[PDB]
Amino acid sequence: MIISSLTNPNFKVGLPKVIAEVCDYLNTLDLNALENGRHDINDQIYMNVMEPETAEPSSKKAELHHEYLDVQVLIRGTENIEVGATYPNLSKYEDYNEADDYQLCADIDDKFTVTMKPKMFAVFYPYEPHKPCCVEKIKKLVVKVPVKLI
């Protein structure tokens, strides 16, 4: 997983090209005024933006994905995302939802919490578990990028 900030003038060091181009593109936008909903960027890449409410961790399931990477960025507010960097125990995950490309699990092993501030972004590759929106209302966006583009 990658954790970084669009605002850091060196955030592109190390980044896969496709991810660098989407971040360079997000830095062009009026992120504040972005409408809620789905926004297409490419044939391949879209993003969803929303104003959810942080909810207590035990109230929601972690997720992971098979086909897309996420680039999540926080726009307004502050948000916790529990994450695991070790490969999940798939035997413990719900059935794969193929239309929305995800599987759920009550919890993350070896989990730790990333605290997100405006313009911070996290990249979670496929099979990287994350439970975003953890503990109050925020604005955020997640970009969905096919991993085959890496």
Interacting residue ranges for a copy of itself, rule: CB under 8 A: 1-5, 7-10, 13-14, 16, 19, 69, 83, 85-87, 110-115, 117, 120, 123, 125-127, 147, 150
Partner whose binding site includes residue 62, from a copy of itself, Cu ion, none (CB under 5 to 8 Å by kind): none
Map the footprint of Cu ion across residues 66-95, applying CB under 5 A: 70
CB nearer a copy of itself, residue 4 or residue 47: 4
Joined together, the tokens standing for residue 111 give: 């989990």
CB proximity list for 91: less than 8 A, separation 6 or greater:
none
Q: Establish whether 66 is an annotated binding residue.
A: no
- Using CA atoms, how far apart are residues 120 and 138, in angstroms rounded to an integer? 13
Q: Least distance in Å: CB of 69 to Cu ion?
A: 8
107 is in an annotated binding site: no
> What are the start-end ranges of the H helices in 34-145?
none
Contacts of 24 (CB under 8 A, 6+ apart): 12
Determine whether the annotation assigns residue 70 to a binding site. yes
SS3 23: helix
**Residue nearest to Cu ion according to CB distances in the complex:** 70
Residue 115's binding partner, choosing from Cu ion, a copy of itself, none, with beta-carbon cut-off 5 to 8 A by kind?
Answer: a copy of itself
Order of strands, sheet of 112-116, starting from the edge strand that comes earlier in the sequence: 103-105, 62-64, 130-134, 79-83, 112-116
Residues in binding site for Cu cation: 65, 70, 130
